[PDB]
Amino acid sequence: ELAKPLTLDQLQQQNGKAIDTRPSAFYNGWPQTLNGPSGHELAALNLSASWLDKMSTEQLNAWIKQHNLKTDAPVALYGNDKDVDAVKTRLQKAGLTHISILSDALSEPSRLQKLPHFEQLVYPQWLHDLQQGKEVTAKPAGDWKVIEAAWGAPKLYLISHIPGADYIDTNEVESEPLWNKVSDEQLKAMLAKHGIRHDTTVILYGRDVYAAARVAQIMLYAGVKDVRLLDGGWQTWSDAGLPVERGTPPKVKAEPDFGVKIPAQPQLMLDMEQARGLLHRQDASLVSIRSWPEFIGTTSGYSYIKPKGEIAGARWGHAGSDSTHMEDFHNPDGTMRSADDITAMWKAWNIKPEQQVSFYCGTGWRASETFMYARAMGWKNVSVYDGGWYEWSSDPKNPVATGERGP
Template sequence: MGKKMKKHFLLIVVLLLGVMAMAACAKEEPAKEETNGAVNVITTEELSSKLEDDSWVVVDTRLNDAYNGWKLEGVKRGGHIKGAVDFSANWLKVEKENKDSILDEALETKGIAKDRNVVLYDANGKDASAVAEYLAGKGYENVYTYDVKQWAEDESLPMEKYENYKNIVPASVVKDILEGKTPETFEEGKKVKMVEASWGEEETSYAKGHIPTAFHINTDIVEPPPAWMLASDKELAQFALGYGFTKEDTVIVSGAEQMAAYRVALVLKYMGVDDVRVLNGGLGAWTAAGYEAETESHKPEPVSDFGAETPVNPDVIDTIEEAKAGLANPEEFTLVDNRTWEEHIGEISGYSYHDKKGRIPGSVFGYAGKTDSYSLDYYRNIDGTMRNADEILALWDEAGLDTNKHLSFMCGSGWRVAEIYAYSNVMGLENTSVFSDGWIGWSNGGNPIETGEPAK
């Protein structure tokens, strides 16, 4: 072989070796297509291979309604990629005094750390980019984006959704209903009643803005002052007829204060309305979606027959006697105290109109809010939507709550736990109830109380 041919041969060998080395590297690391500065696109095959790799974290950046199970933005299957955590781009838009610390805590809780490879996925090409930009500003480097529509198209790839995700409704679905469309999980041809629940007369909240066509319910109707305990079954039956509710109804309850909406929803479920849902995130979710609130007043049409003997679902709400019987059987029953820690140990009563402090003996602290008796920080995302179920269950596990037992949720008088009870149902937990009279009803009845930190 001549010198020239030898040189050409050696050159070809070197080039082939280089190509082989590049191919080997490509197998080890995901292909990176520059799309947003340091952000790279990852393929479905590559993402699938990383789900069990602890050095990777997969993040759903869409609205939490999509994470929960709703098929939004043209996605074929509802829910989230199995194992994914949530960090919605919507959270970045919230105006809140302690926003930075709340978001930092969320990143830590969800394991979205700088030393991990972070895959951000969406369905609109915008949410993942917004979160990627936010993370870049915090020094994150190994960030990838992905279009979840591709994943949803392949039925063999695992997705998860909450068993009863339909119970809390996205603003976009409410909008579709108002426009005469029939979204998923809603029966075609069935009229949906829109309700705004808030404390006080219309001018207090309703008149300032509500979901279009919604009529107002003052929560004083279902829990009359000055005690603000749940009204009697007879009074609740009159309430249902006066506001036009029947057993066959489908109802969506909303409001500027979500606890009021969940409180009314709980009462309607107790009475026996077949299909009761709540707008996830309340009126704030409606306006954040860019929809206009209405100020026109609407009135319900009374009915003469509910369609069944009420309450249809008495097991939804526990009486004091039932709570006492449950406490006597701790192997099967847990009374969950969803108040602040300060209320639980008796440092404060939590209410300006109630001075008794302490807790019910045998109750187990189950978290609520961090500030006062109207906060639910441990159960809500920063935008007011339901926190993801895995994190709620982790809280309960830390508190020693066993979901195999019957969980009866209690707070001061039923507002906070109406929302927590609804979330438990969304998660698929059916062996739950609400001790509606709560701490106020118990302590006013002269029953035993405890103060101080509980024994471990």
């Protein structure tokens, strides 16, 4: 059973921590109802009851230690009753000894904290409701498109996809020889074919978030003003049990006139020499979003990239276990991890919002995901260095760092 309830001020006086047991969408800032409260209590941690069946004892234990919860320091939970009880039970089994309810949680909307642009990382019920013609928070200001992105021709999309979702093949936005973005003229044709003007809202999802992210960032470069991602991609829609549609992509009405000159935001993409110029500075960071084996030089990550090693002077931004995973940015349900947590992860390696920051990996997909998360987090000067390791290392004169090493 729960300890004595605590108000936030009592919690602060007793040096405790608040834990928001709601899904991350609500933690991030999505209101649970129209004009409803937006965000989480100050310095709150997010442990969503919905993640518990995907977190082992080890995983929860690591999470407790990584957030500096002391066994006997008060923790005050909030959210719905059932989610609060589920969290309480696991935390008790993990050995926390002072678990209470935060009795005034969410009662003062003006004191809550949120992702500066949480509305860029959407969630399934929002998108269903949008589709159904309901009023939603942060509604698209005008026309909108929902689009699944994956490599190659539609595969899983044919079996199942989000109702009314188009499909983009990532090969429409990037190509040989270097898996850099196709030309400004080719993006113009791709935008037109997918019914996208600069003032069209685009919501992108993939089986893998980074596929969506990559399309997304390249559309932001071109000039689509309002581009967003389904947070956690397809598996969140699947998990929610919402309706699906099947079969080939339906006809989309083309938009032959984009309505501004492409690229409207060239600064969001950096070339080799721009990337080079960030290195060895405190006011900028060129950031490797590659697995640690990539980063130290054990492997290149890619069957088609012979060289091994890292851009010398690049700072490690974390990423995932191999070249096609992104665990270091995901919660157990595949959604973006807490901004406070990403922020501390990057700060430990001297990566900070006040710097000019550019992310890269082997060819750009993982860097695109981190780009979109930093955008949602309010980071004002971020980009992707497209060519990345494949480009960097294709010239033997570029400097390469190797081996285990710290900040």
